[PDB]
Amino acid sequence: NDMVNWGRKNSIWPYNFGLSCCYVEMVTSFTAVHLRASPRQADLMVVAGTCFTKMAPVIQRLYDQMLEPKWVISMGACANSGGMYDIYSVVQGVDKFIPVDVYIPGCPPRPEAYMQALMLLQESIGKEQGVYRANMQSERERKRGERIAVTNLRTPDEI
Amino acid sequence: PAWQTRDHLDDPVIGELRNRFGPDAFTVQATRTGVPVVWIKREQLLEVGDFLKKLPKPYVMLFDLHGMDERLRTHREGLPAADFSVFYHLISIDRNRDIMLKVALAENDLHVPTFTKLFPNANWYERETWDLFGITFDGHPNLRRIMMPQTWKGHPLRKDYPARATEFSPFELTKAKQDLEMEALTFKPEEWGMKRGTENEDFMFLNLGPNHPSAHGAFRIVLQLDGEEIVDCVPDIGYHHRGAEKMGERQSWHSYIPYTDRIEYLGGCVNEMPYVLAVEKLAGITVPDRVNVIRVMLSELFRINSHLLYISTFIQDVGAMTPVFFAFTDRQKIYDLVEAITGFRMHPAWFRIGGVAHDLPRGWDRLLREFLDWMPKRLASYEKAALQNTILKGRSQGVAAYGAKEALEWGTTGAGLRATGIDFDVRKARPYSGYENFDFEIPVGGGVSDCYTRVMLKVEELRQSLRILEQCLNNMPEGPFKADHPLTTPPPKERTLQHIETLITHFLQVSWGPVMPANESFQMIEATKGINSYYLTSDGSTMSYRTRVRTPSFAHLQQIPAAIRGSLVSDLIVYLGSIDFVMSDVDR
Amino acid sequence: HAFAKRETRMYPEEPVYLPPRYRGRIVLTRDPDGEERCVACNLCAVACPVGCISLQKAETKDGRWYPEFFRINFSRCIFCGLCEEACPTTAIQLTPDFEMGEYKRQDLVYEKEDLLISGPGKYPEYNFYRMAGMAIDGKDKGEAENEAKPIDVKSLLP
Amino acid sequence: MATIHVDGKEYEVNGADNLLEACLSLGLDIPYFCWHPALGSVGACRQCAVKQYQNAEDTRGRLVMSCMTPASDGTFISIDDEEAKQFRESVVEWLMTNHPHDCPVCEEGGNCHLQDMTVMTGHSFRRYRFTKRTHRNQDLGPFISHEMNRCIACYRCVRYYKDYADGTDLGVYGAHDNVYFGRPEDGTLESEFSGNLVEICPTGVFTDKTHSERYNRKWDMQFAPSI
Numbered sequence A: 001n002d003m004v005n006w007g008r009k010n011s012i013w014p015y016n017f018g019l020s021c022c023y024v025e026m027v028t029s030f031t032a033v034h035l036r037a038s039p040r041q042a043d044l045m046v047v048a049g050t051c052f053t054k055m056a057p058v059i060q061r062l063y064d065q066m067l068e069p070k071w072v073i074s075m076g077a078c079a080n081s082g083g084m085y086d087i088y089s090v091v092q093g094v095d096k097f098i099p100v101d102v103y104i105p106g107c108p109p110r111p112e113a114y115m116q117a118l119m120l121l122q123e124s125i126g127k128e129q130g131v132y133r134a135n136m137q138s139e140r141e142r143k144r145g146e147r148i149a150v151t152n153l154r155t156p157d158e159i
Numbered sequence B: 001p002a003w004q005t006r007d008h009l010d011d012p013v014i015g016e017l018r019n020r021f022g023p024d025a026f027t028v029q030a031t032r033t034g035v036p037v038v039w040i041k042r043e044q045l046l047e048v049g050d051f052l053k054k055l056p057k058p059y060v061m062l063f064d065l066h067g068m069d070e071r072l073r074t075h076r077e078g079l080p081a082a083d084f085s086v087f088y089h090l091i092s093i094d095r096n097r098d099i100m101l102k103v104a105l106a107e108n109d110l111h112v113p114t115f116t117k118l119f120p121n122a123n124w125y126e127r128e129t130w131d132l133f134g135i136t137f138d139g140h141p142n143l144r145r146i147m148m149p150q151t152w153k154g155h156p157l158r159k160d161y162p163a164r165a166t167e168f169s170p171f172e173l174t175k176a177k178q179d180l181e182m183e184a185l186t187f188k189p190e191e192w193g194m195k196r197g198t199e200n201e202d203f204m205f206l207n208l209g210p211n212h213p214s215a216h217g218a219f220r221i222v223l224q225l226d227g228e229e230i231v232d233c234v235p236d237i238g239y240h241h242r243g244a245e246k247m248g249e250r251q252s253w254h255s256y257i258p259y260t261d262r263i264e265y266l267g268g269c270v271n272e273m274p275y276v277l278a279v280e281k282l283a284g285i286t287v288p289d290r291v292n293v294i295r296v297m298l299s300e301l302f303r304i305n306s307h308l309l310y311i312s313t314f315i316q317d318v319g320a321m322t323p324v325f326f327a328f329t330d331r332q333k334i335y336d337l338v339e340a341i342t343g344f345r346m347h348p349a350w351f352r353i354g355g356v357a358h359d360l361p362r363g364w365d366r367l368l369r370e371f372l373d374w375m376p377k378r379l380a381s382y383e384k385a386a387l388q389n390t391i392l393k394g395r396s397q398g399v400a401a402y403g404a405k406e407a408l409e410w411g412t413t414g415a416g417l418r419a420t421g422i423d424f425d426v427r428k429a430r431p432y433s434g435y436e437n438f439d440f441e442i443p444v445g446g447g448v449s450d451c452y453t454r455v456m457l458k459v460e461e462l463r464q465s466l467r468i469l470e471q472c473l474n475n476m477p478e479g480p481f482k483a484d485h486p487l488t489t490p491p492p493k494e495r496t497l498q499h500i501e502t503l504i505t506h507f508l509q510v511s512w513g514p515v516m517p518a519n520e521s522f523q524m525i526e527a528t529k530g531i532n533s534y535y536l537t538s539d540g541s542t543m544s545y546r547t548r549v550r551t552p553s554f555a556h557l558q559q560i561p562a563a564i565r566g567s568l569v570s571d572l573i574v575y576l577g578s579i580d581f582v583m584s585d586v587d588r
Numbered sequence C: 001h002a003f004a005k006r007e008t009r010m011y012p013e014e015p016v017y018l019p020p021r022y023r024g025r026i027v028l029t030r031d032p033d034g035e036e037r038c039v040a041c042n043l044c045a046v047a048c049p050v051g052c053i054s055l056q057k058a059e060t061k062d063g064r065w066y067p068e069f070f071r072i073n074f075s076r077c078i079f080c081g082l083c084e085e086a087c088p089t090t091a092i093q094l095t096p097d098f099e100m101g102e103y104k105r106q107d108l109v110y111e112k113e114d115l116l117i118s119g120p121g122k123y124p125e126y127n128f129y130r131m132a133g134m135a136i137d138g139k140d141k142g143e144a145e146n147e148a149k150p151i152d153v154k155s156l157l158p
Numbered sequence D: 001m002a003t004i005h006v007d008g009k010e011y012e013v014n015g016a017d018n019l020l021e022a023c024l025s026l027g028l029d030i031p032y033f034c035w036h037p038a039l040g041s042v043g044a045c046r047q048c049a050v051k052q053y054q055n056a057e058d059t060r061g062r063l064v065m066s067c068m069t070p071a072s073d074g075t076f077i078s079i080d081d082e083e084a085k086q087f088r089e090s091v092v093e094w095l096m097t098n099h100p101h102d103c104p105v106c107e108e109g110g111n112c113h114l115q116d117m118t119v120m121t122g123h124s125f126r127r128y129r130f131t132k133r134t135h136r137n138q139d140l141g142p143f144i145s146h147e148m149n150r151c152i153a154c155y156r157c158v159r160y161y162k163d164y165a166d167g168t169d170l171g172v173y174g175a176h177d178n179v180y181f182g183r184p185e186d187g188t189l190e191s192e193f194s195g196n197l198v199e200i201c202p203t204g205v206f207t208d209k210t211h212s213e214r215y216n217r218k219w220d221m222q223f224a225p226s227i
């Protein structure tokens, strides 16, 4: 029937863990798309910002608290990897210690990128981690012939 | 010129100290900091400072206290033999002057008496010097590690310490299990500060770490409670340490510019201004007038955006948030203009040494004119909505107030210090970036600094900034966007694409880096929050030898325990919201 | 109903407005003659503060420098645009396109076939080899801009 | 042995040495092309110009070449004299009038002495608008590639190859601005010490052909001391 799968695609509960920077665009997105988000109630955790060695146990306790079906979206270069901060005090990505499902490059990403993250995450949630032998197709490979066919762009002396 | 190497030996303070102590001991360094740098052996530091503290026009505010390694400097002509050094930047407001004091230390005897007794705000500064270096300050009350965890071995700002995470072992979670065991066994040994009260039913220990919104970053403030009173509040900072200062040592002068944008997420080009000004002070570059006006335009736009965010969040937490959410749409318009000029909404990384990255696109004036004519009616709607409101005004009077003396001892600058009667802006006292060719006023709060006064002053400053932005629209002159100088990095790109010598200059400047001769520069600006400065030392190479970033939020967050002692947890949260502190700035 | 009327519910718009200078997706462009513009000068790799570019120079029998491989790690890229302004051929450019998202980090590393587009991008007319002294097909010595013909040492004229 | 006065300061130098190796021994940066420590001074490039005064009270002296002037006791020189700086920048500009637009596609890029001296003098603005002289190249073996457009006529190659190494098959041809450095006819350079030309030539005329198969810039190299 796959009614159970339909249930999870239609509705998701977001836990916003945006840090010092990179969360103002996430707020810009959240106040347009949407006090409901609550700890130990959500199944989606959008890790944003730079993951630091000192506060990483906090993210690991919040990861442990959520229920069995766990989704994680890494947004920004500072959360996908160490980003620009390849330094003693920053861990090189949140994927070192928690599994991650979707990666959204940028610094900071755009609200439309958050929208496309929900679209790729309902697409993964609708194929059952969601590999299902369908996720080998990649956004690098899916729109490749779209991107290569671009020839002309507006000159940058204009608005 | 304003970049030439001066000794400042003629300055009156140098002659008063020479009269008082006669000859010897003092070696007046030659630098481009603009201030007099004096070396003073460590056995007389407390005496010397005391003399300056009580001088007939005293140096009331300790701007900065930090250390330098100095071990690897090959060009050391005139300095005494030092293996380490500690610098103290002091400011006299009544003299509008500064003085820098340098104490030399040897590698075997890194010991100096603590300076906290004269200036209390130095306490955390000395703690940072203990954390990042290995100088032990004898007589310090609580000399513990303030940035790294308590089991972190090594002093990260020493040059024998490898900077990058790659040189250490990757996150194999060998230490994650030990941090998990430590966090699970969360108990208080009473070593977290004075902690005079014992851990019993009489005093309750509460982490009180706000992870909610408007917290301006996730931090912990361990609090001792008795009768719902703040017996002792101890912040646990350092979670958002990004190692920007250490990062400055392994990046060229040009490729570091992106790192400046992230000391403060909301600042953008305000954070870039002091860095480019200091690097051009090392290079000896005078920029054209158009560069000055362009930089003023971008800095006042970012200042307007930051002030509008501070006002909106203040009205949201302690008041009615229904109308002020329209400012979110207005902030988008300020952003569409920034990405019209620079390219990207946040972290522009658009300022360069000697100029800017590109010229203004031809439709900038019409967009800025439409925003400047449209905005004042909305600004007056916020002025009526905030000046005339009664509920938060009644709530926001006398809530953790302080005076001029209290702000001075705690290094507090900005809207906090302007809320008292001290008329001190740096844009008028020490004009930079062509502010001396503009007409604007400094609002002032009188003698009481509280939450209503700070927001009213921020609204008045936002109106003066809008007057500056209209003067930028109506008096933008014509000519180049980049200085003509061999150290302007990069060269104009159309010249690079056709001319061989410009191509060679661009080739070596973007690859090896520009070679700045060995000297020391220092610039401070009025930031969106307080006074932000950059103290850069070059050893003659293409990378910085020492980068010190003074952020005011560190001092503003250090000030809370003096004022909030004798208040409720609600007054604490309201004060934390009112004070202009961001975790990224406190931890750089 | 009047309060709901003035606060109309927001409707998302499928078209998105970006300025020309927007710093999104990194592309490699082509000459107006149709050849790849990148000469593997390795300035973009060194000028990047985070080090997200790896490339190797190749050389045709014709003598045209071109990259054997070009690799950008977009997981670490911050879109600072220092690479675009470092490039002395305008080969690498930033386009208004932020549409990126992937299930695996290994698929965020872009090769030359994911970056090389079919046209010239922001600057339709600039060709670097017309300026350069180096000789390629269609361009013998003295066929560059502001370059005179080669005079041999054996010429009779003194 | 000798005491010299440079820009007011005083230094101790060897009297037998010339002023360029004396000032370079003290860490004073003077640009140069044609001088080499092994090869000696000939005075061709005119790049090492300094202002020399007769004594401490002479305010207006003459521009001399530090490679061609002995560092005798009592010498008064100024490296940073404004007229000397203008002359050295002008010499760099005159060498820049005919240089090809090749740095992105030059194997010497990032390792080029001419780039370093151009930045050191501070010449970044082109005034010359006329045509550039060009030359055809030669084949010099499987080891050394040749791009004569990049030559600055410093004469280091002929002074190394004939005088020092006693090679016979490299010379200078032509006259005025048409000087050509190479072989009389294409063919492998016969000398067993031909490859030092890649270090001796300050530009990218003679470059390593074995390195140009798999080229990378110097900043991307990893080095160790080996035997």
Ligand code: SF4
Pocket (backbone or CB within 6 Å): A021, A022, A023, A048, A049, A050, A075, A076, A077, A078, A079, A083, A106, A107, A108, A109, B262
């Ligand atoms: S991704 Fe960009 S905005 Fe987000 S934390 Fe990193 S640098 Fe800041």
Ligand code: SF4
Pocket (backbone or CB within 6 Å): C037, C038, C039, C040, C041, C042, C043, C044, C045, C055, C086, C087, C088, C089, C090, C091, C092
């Ligand atoms: S700078 Fe531009 S042309 Fe040179 S290697 Fe990089 S991308 Fe290619």
Ligand code: SF4
Pocket (backbone or CB within 6 Å): C047, C048, C049, C050, C051, C052, C053, C072, C076, C077, C078, C079, C080, C081, C082, C083, C084
């Ligand atoms: S945009 Fe910035 S981070 Fe990305 S490749 Fe270019 S220089 Fe590196």
Ligand code: SF4
Pocket (backbone or CB within 6 Å): B504, D099, D100, D101, D102, D103, D104, D106, D107, D108, D109, D110, D112, D113, D114, D115, D150, D203, D204, D205
């Ligand atoms: S040889 Fe030197 S000066 Fe000539 S193009 Fe190459 S790097 Fe530039």
Ligand code: SF4
Pocket (backbone or CB within 6 Å): D150, D151, D152, D153, D154, D155, D156, D157, D158, D181, D200, D201, D202, D203, D205, D206
């Ligand atoms: S070929 Fe090289 S060594 Fe010979 S004159 Fe020209 S630049 Fe000097």
Ligand code: FES
Pocket (backbone or CB within 6 Å): D020, D031, D032, D033, D034, D035, D041, D042, D043, D044, D045, D046, D047, D048, D065, D066, D067, D068
């Ligand atoms: S290097 Fe001294 S004159 Fe040529």
